[PDB]
Symmetry: D2
Subunit: 326 residues, 4 copies
Amino acid sequence: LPNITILATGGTIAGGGDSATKSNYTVGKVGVENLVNAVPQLKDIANVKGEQVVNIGSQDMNDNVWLTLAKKINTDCDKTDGFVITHGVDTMEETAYFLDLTVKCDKPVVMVGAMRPSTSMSADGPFNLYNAVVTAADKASANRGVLVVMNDTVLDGRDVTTTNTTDVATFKSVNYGPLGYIHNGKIDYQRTPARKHTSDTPFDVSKLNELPKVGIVYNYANASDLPAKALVDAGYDGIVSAGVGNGNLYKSVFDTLATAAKTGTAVVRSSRVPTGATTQDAEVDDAKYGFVASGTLNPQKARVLLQLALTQTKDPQQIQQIFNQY
Amino acid sequence: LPNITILATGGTIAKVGVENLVNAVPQLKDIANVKGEQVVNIGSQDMNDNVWLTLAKKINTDCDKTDGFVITHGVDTMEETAYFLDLTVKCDKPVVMVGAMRPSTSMSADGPFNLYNAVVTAADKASANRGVLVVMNDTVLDGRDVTTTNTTDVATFKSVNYGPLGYIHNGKIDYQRTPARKHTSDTPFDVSKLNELPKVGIVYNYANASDLPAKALVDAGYDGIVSAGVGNGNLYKSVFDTLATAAKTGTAVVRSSRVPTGATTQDAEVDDAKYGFVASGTLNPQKARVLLQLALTQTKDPQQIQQIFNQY
Amino acid sequence: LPNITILATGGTIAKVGVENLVNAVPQLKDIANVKGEQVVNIGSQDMNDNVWLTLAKKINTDCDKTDGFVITHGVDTMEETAYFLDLTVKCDKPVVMVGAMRPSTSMSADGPFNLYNAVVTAADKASANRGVLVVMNDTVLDGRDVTTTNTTDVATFKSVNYGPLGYIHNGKIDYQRTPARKHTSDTPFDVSKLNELPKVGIVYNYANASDLPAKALVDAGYDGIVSAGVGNGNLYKSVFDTLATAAKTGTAVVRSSRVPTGATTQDAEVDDAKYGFVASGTLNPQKARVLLQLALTQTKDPQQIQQIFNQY
Amino acid sequence: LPNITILATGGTIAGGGDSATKSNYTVGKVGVENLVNAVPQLKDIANVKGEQVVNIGSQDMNDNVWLTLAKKINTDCDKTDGFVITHGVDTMEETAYFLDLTVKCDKPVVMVGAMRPSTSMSADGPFNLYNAVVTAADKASANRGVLVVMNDTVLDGRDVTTTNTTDVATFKSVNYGPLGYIHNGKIDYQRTPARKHTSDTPFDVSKLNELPKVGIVYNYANASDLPAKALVDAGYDGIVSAGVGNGNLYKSVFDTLATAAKTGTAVVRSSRVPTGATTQDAEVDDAKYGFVASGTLNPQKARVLLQLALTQTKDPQQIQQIFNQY
Ligand SMILES: NC(=O)C[C@H](N)C(=O)O
Ligand SMILES: NC(=O)C[C@H](N)C(=O)O
Ligand SMILES: NC(=O)C[C@H](N)C(=O)O
Ligand SMILES: NC(=O)C[C@H](N)C(=O)O
């Protein structure tokens, strides 16, 4: 049976409340040892080894925990057959994409969380962790990049997002669909992401102790420019726009970001809209303003790529190329 | 034949004038006597408080002069205007908003049959007392739950939490649902003598989120801040600290979510009562902003604002 | 505390007896006084007219003896029973159906919290006069639009055309919708002295479809045949010819669709009036069968059957 | 500009009614020449050549039109750069899967239809046909198997199905998602079907003048066995069950199909449920009864594979293997 490392980071999968029934809970309060011991059947599929990297709600996920995870996976690659990462739901789609672009270990890297605390009735965490180990132990899971395994489904780290605030079925690859489905401990894979990931990206974080500063500003009717101005005034390396419709910007926000672009801030148009590409050749002249179109990457995922892009280049054309390949 | 007023505001369905739009669909004469008046001609990315105020007042004033309203509008903020009119219009005659994903000049342009189906809906008396509607892709959607789900799909508009009110086939609607939340003339919001709305801003949550956006709104003395939280409306610690402060310093704070479906609930990870925060329910950030603006024309009390978020 | 009767019928949520199921969720005592009675213990793949009849009569008879009903049932035909009870139950006290995708013995078993949420729903007086409900995956679904969308997903149950009535969080439901179609005590269907229903069969359409299934139903003298058509309820020519004949020989014919969402409409490719066929609207084949069976306890007239399909 | 053959088969894309407004229309009433001439902009992307194979509603699609299409594509492969197939919506998902298993031409084969007649306001047919030509002319569309292009999206023939009776957005790959999205005449491909198709299947129809007889029976509460009995009595080579939930059968239907199986009828459990696999190792002992599990293949698609399987073998274990690879 293969050797599988759980790296624990916290999340509701490690959460607890005073009632099995009430919705109230506090996050990252349970050790990895406890999560493992709640899944007795893990022994039938893997030799499991828990390490506790941090114990936080993923609402508090940050650059430093991203660098710690990537370096640790890359360092320990030769020491194990696979990784599972216990992690909160809230920013899982961000961590998952960061590790998909930075880890050079082509052995299965599987992220897993839970929508209901360990303490709740019909808790989802136990079977999720069982299914994440299944996936990490599966030879066919190798060379697919970093994965998220929730509700019996294997999702690629690039497309995967959380679609509902409470539903155990929340995680979906809303543009290009899942990679495979798990039934009775077995996976039928029918898809692998074409976009370049892991050992095919030039992004190497092994030496990095910080990441370029990238902010996200929201567009809506009568949008204030003040949030954009604050990011520019703090000398942010990049700004991602959560645009309306096909990545459009309220006029005030537009003007601030056009200005910033001219002083060498990187500016990526994304969209607040939950599915579909922010395209070139729409209502915005990107090449004129020195803006980048995010494609299918939602604002939080575009931040992930823009940060790593800013470690290679500050040129809008080369950042546009990066957004077309990764 | 019903009298139906088209108020035009712009969007991709049109620079093209109100009268061209109508003339492009001679079949409208089959179903209504339509008058078109131009209110603005802008991209809905540039929609604003002033246009909202113009629209509410024009529909309220002109209610008794027509049998129905169609509002031609951009797709990008259609869901914001629709909810704003939903809460401020006192006309319970049908008010139908319509747009298009493709221009008039494009292959298989959606604008024509959309406008036709939006006049069918405005001409149907069964459409009365359902609040403000969005009609797109042969579907009748309530102004509260309706949102754009895709950047380019003609089928983008969906009521993603509670579903459509009705489907249009052969110029007829089978209506099987109506919004339970209080709308139009069952709301206390009265905008007839208002010339501006409270200043409400939206800040985004993500990993390593800056508190600078939230600080810049507090520094401006914004009336309100909506959080597009992560998951069930949760806040990155820096943003949590800045909004905790905001809430006890005369800024109403609403927790919404960047997650496209489901409620931001009470009784999860956040003690709303302890911070004086309001949980948005199924209102996404831009919709929460609409209702927070209007709640602040009545009150600044976090408890009274939360009751508003529970009723409308 | 509400009195709530659980009628158990089997399914994966259970061979396990009614009283084990309850005892497995001691938290039920927090929200209701629950009595469990066993009605059958079968897989819902083996659900049948007799069980339907037992259930309608038991709920109608016992309505005045309890505050609410929960029916534990298999997932596979849950959507058929739910609609049948929706049209035949005269009790407008809450009637809630519940199942599970995973057994009691499985990791992260869904059965417990499902039963808990199904008792919350049956105990909520706001659940009254909404017709027969299905509560699965923290969602309250109307018995007419609800269907299983996935072979193994715990989130399988959806009201795919008109959306849910409400979401359950922390034992509380925000109800924002109610089915407009006539249900329970607003229907003329009365099954109290019926011991069998008319024989209705379902035939499938596809490329090169055999007419033999449809002929075997006609040869049996079936009371009715539902077509699971292709697209907008269209029929392979051989099947069209056999059902054209059926319809003028004392077999009611309903055009439904194998397509999982949308209405089978009139006024498309098929002259329903010329063939004496009925268009099912949003009723999928197995639901159309429910309503065709009950329509045939009142009438055989294709026009009167179509009016039924337009009202219920 | 590449040489693209339209093969026309009819469907609503070639349909007409007496009103642009009314929903009433008759199918397959317009010639290919007319469809081409309604899309003036086709000249900018392709040298188009129309041939009219048949003019029928796809509700009347049949084995003989399937054999005619496959042999014609395979015969003409060397004569063109790509194929588009104008076809009705109703059974497109069936034809698309049949051609995906039988055509040996690895040049783009693209199917296209329309939900609104040519005569209707905002007809979808014109832009669909433009987008199907774009896809057929795209070099990257080669070696992806047979495609369906509707509503700006490229779908693989295996997973693609129609999900709504009237909606122009109806066609979706409901299990594994689309292959790419078309914006402004350009496609970003992120997926290719893993299941074997075209020149990697052993199915060769070049000599065939008929197909094995396969029927579909529907399960529901109180299901009659009479439809199953009629198929068995007519000596059908196979029967597909549209099962309830995870491919379950009403007891009467079960008994008839178990019996048939024992006399060498092939029996495949599918599901009436619109998404998810009909799995092995559930409520049915398949190996005991000599039944086959359809996996993600809906009943009409399982008929397609079962017919072609029955041209190689009558053995339930080998048919199960075929359902695991194609
Ligand atoms: N379900 C969850 O894990 C939510 C939690 N706030 C987290 O992201 O850590
Ligand atoms: N299709 C559209 O309407 C997009 C446009 N930017 C608008 O919202 O006005
Ligand atoms: N999960 C389930 O309930 C499936 C089972 N065959 C039933 O419907 O009874
Ligand atoms: N839209 C369509 O094409 C429907 C038509 N009955 C067909 O399949 O030919």
